[PDB]
Design a protein around this ligand. Structure first.
Ligand SMILES: CC(C)(COP(=O)(O)OP(=O)(O)OC[C@H]1O[C@@H](n2cnc3c(N)ncnc32)[C@H](O)[C@@H]1OP(=O)(O)O)[C@@H](O)C(=O)NCCC(=O)NCCS
Lengths: 294, 294
């Protein structure tokens, strides 16, 4: 990793923790600049230096330092290591905001990444409230692809992350969603359960009473959801297993399910892969496991 | 129906096809304005009148005509009927663009719809390319909630629809994904099939051959996917029913499945609800029905 990236007004030089740390500290040391970061602002240029090293260390991590015409070092931008599908970062010091640097830099990294960089696509996870970042990602050409929940140990609670992406390959055929059907005796009754326990809603319902319905797990369209189909009187129903990635605290999600009178596992159990989970079992046997960051 | 909306500079009067059609035809009859529309530009004011009447007829439809101070009718805006999740529209005549009318009207409709409209949320499905429309939705406070694929009869092929929405209040406990598990005999075998027929990819595996894996239906960190689990007992497995909302042409998706040697119930059959579908059956019974706009 020694690729030098040249833009209209910037020069991206391979990040060298040792010499750059001093400059990059007006960024990582700034609490206002680190508000959306995965960790608290570094206390001193030394801390910044070590962290920049672990970051640079990561497998496949190729970070660059940004140098402006005036000879300033606006900040850093590059690809994160340990993602499988190429990650993306950047951060500037306040004094260097609103100059279209981030967008110019990020664009250099992504264009390079897809160009003679050896990558078919790139990602960028940005928090929901990070307007600044989302805007840059948009300017660069990264479009939303999914959403996930995460939790930073320094933060009091979890948060939603936006997975934006861009590919040199415009995959034509692709799947937008997967709606799984659950055989149930009383669709209506189920719908009432699901709405209460999981905060779902009836996207639609055929039959009076319902014979086949769809429970939307979000108040929008084209979101997570599963269908319900009424089962033929007698005869057991082989359980269906669903994994629900939810937003919010497992405690709240659990409190809701219980208060909704649903058949729950027991309190959420902290799983090794860093996710708290608990299971909801429907009368028919079906098991809906609910997992959150915390 | 009634309701008259007043803004800073505009007056939104309940749409009256008969009276307004003449004016609104400067929009509906213009090919450049009608670019991103669900149907071609209207041939004449009469056609525009007819269309406006059906639109007005739609269940729950509440449209408004936009009148400017200078006594002109820049265009129209309002709420779409029979959409389940409150819909939204708007359009202006070419010579009325770039005046902030759309944003003003739209803002009024939304503002009215959430407070005094007795509605909880509102949506706006805009095409990826429609930059001007996306900007309006933005200025109004509509944020991306999803994406879907659609096809307009007059169009040669399908397109990507962005789903933006706004709520008087958001729900914390929401689900971001639903991963369903499929009991299979040979996880490795299934994965090879799925990868071929559904262009999937193994997000991860557990074993050699894996006894538990996850097939991501997209090349991104998050998104549509299901888990495979090696069935223990050497007995029969009750099939699971999965519905996949695909992007692209049904023909293509079909060709790919067949060429991947997958068990297809037959070519794509046009379903009444405007969706082309065919079914893929996994050796263990599981039926994955694939549906695309066309
Ligand atoms: C409906 C729509 C997209 C209007 O475009 P628009 O006129 O640019 O939207 P506005 O009416 O909010 O105009 C905003 C522009 O006018 C400017 N403007 C001028 N005077 C203004 C004022 N007093 N207040 C606010 N903005 C003003 C804005 O700054 C902005 O300039 P810019 O976008 O060029 O940088 C229009 O282009 C259209 O008819 N599109 C086709 C119909 C369609 O596809 N609809 C989608 C179905 S949901």
């Amino acid at each position: 990793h020694t690729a030098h990236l040249r833009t209209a007004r910037l020069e991206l030089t391979p990040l060298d923790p040792a010499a750059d740390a001093r400059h990059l500290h007006h960024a990582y040391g700034d609490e206002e600049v680190m508000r959306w970061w995965t960790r608290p602002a570094c206390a001193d240029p030394a801390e910044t230096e070590r962290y920049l090293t672990s970051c640079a260390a990561a497998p496949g991590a190729r970070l660059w330092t940004i140098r402006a015409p005036d000879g300033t070092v606006p900040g850093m931008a590059g690809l994160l290591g340990g993602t499988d599908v190429p990650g993306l970062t950047w951060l500037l010091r306040r004094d260097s905001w609103g100059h279209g640097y981030a967008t110019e830099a990020a664009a250099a990294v992504v264009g390079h990444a897809l160009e003679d960089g050896g990558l078919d696509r790139v990602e960028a996870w940005i928090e929901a409230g990070n307007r600044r970042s989302l805007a840059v990602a948009a300017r660069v050409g990264l479009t939303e692809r999914a959403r996930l929940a995460q939790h930073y140990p320094h933060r009091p609670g979890p948060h939603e992350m936006v997975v934006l992406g861009k590919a040199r390959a415009e995959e034509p055929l692709t799947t937008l969603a997967v709606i799984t059907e659950l055989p149930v005796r009383d669709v209506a009754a189920t719908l009432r359960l699901v709405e209460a326990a999981l905060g779902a809603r009836t996207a639609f319902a055929i039959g009076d009473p319902p014979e086949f319905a769809e429970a939307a797990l979000t108040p929008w369209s084209a979101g997570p959801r599963f269908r319900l189909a009424a089962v033929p009187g007698p005869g057991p129903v082989e359980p269906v297993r669903l994994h629900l990635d939810a937003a919010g605290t497992a405690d709240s999600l659990h409190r809701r399910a219980v208060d909704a009178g649903a058949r729950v596992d027991g309190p959420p159990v902290r799983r090794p892969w860093g996710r708290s989970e608990f299971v909801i079992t429907l009368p028919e046997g079906h098991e809906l496991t609910v997992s959150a960051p915390v």
